[PDB]
Write a protein that binds this DNA or RNA. Structure first.
Length: 293
DNA sequence: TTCCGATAGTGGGGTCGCAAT
């Protein structure tokens, strides 16, 4: 009845791929954490910050899925309030409870929510803790593109990362949902822009010893020792109207080949790219290359 | 045959912990 691996959403690109009716909720820009005896991270590791871990373990019932987030604080702030091994943590913090696996991970989302709602009725005190504020994310029923778009405007105005779209009957898949499956979709609005290439960096093959991880997936260390330099581009430093940062994703095999092949004659060129504004500290967040010119 | 889920790989930004400076 436990959760093998956390549920992961798929990136929604075409608003047309959304199936209706569907239930939606706001996507928090916090840190994922599921309750399995104790509080675990997206990679099922224990939440470093013991105060939180311990606290949440007392309030949250076994099998709670949600995100830890410091209200008002920046992402980098919340990151620290969770990734640090605090002995004593006095500051306040919230936990957005959005899923609940009591027994069968095949129970329709709506029902899993119901199970979450019920638990609350029985333990109202959880939503009243003096420090930890537990926030139940009860989905909203969306019937068509129009309503959805309306919802996006709402959550966004309220300062959320985006919106999570789920299938009413959807199950708690132990893995990343697919577009077609439509179990859990992530809807984020990136922004277009352009920057000027100023330099390039070689691709690096991580030849570190291959092992297994908490879920049994290929895991390799990141020691520079086992980093062999490939003869192709890996990332490109660019100047976005003043600000400088790198872009290394969004390129295909042949592109990385060309870009590196003409590293010298490529400098100075203008390239398009998309990025997310929210969360950006000193440079664009999730920078993704799109094309040249 | 084509199509698609699942998976290894490679990339960004940014913080924590720890040894070295």
């Amino acid at each position: 009845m436990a959760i093998t691996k956390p549920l992961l959403a798929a990136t929604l690109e075409n608003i047309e791929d959304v199936q209706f009716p569907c239930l939606a909720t706001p996507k928090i820009d916090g840190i994922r954490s599921v309750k399995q005896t104790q509080m675990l991270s997206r990679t099922f590791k224990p939440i470093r910050n013991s105060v939180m871990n311990r606290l949440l373990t007392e309030l949250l019932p076994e099998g709670s899925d949600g995100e830890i987030s410091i209200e008002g604080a920046t992402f980098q702030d919340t990151t620290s309030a969770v990734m640090t091994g605090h002995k004593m943590y006095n500051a306040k913090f919230s936990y957005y409870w959005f899923d609940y696996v009591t027994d069968d991970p095949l129970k329709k989302y709506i029902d899993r929510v119901e199970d979450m709602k019920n638990y609350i009725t029985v333990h109202p005190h959880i939503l009243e803790h003096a420090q930890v504020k537990i926030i139940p994310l009860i989905p909203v029923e969306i019937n068509n593109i129009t309503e959805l778009l309306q919802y996006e405007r709402d959550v966004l105005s309220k300062g959320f990362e985006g919106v999570m779209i789920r299938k009413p009957d959807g199950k708690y898949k132990f893995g990343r949902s697919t577009l077609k499956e439509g179990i859990l979709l992530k809807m984020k609005q990136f922004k277009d822009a352009e920057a000027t290439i100023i330099s390039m960096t070689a691709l690096f093959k991580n030849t570190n010893t291959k092992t297994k991880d908490n879920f049994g997936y290929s895991k390799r260390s990141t020691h520079k020792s086992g980093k062999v330099e490939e003869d192709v581009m890996g990332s490109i430093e660019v100047d976005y109207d003043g600000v400088v940062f790198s872009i290394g994703t969004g390129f295909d095999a042949d592109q990385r080949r060309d870009f590196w092949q003409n590293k010298e004659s490529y400098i100075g060129k203008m390239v398009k790219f998309k990025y997310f504004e929210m969360g950006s500290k000193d440079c664009p967040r999730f920078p993704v290359f799109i094309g040249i010119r």
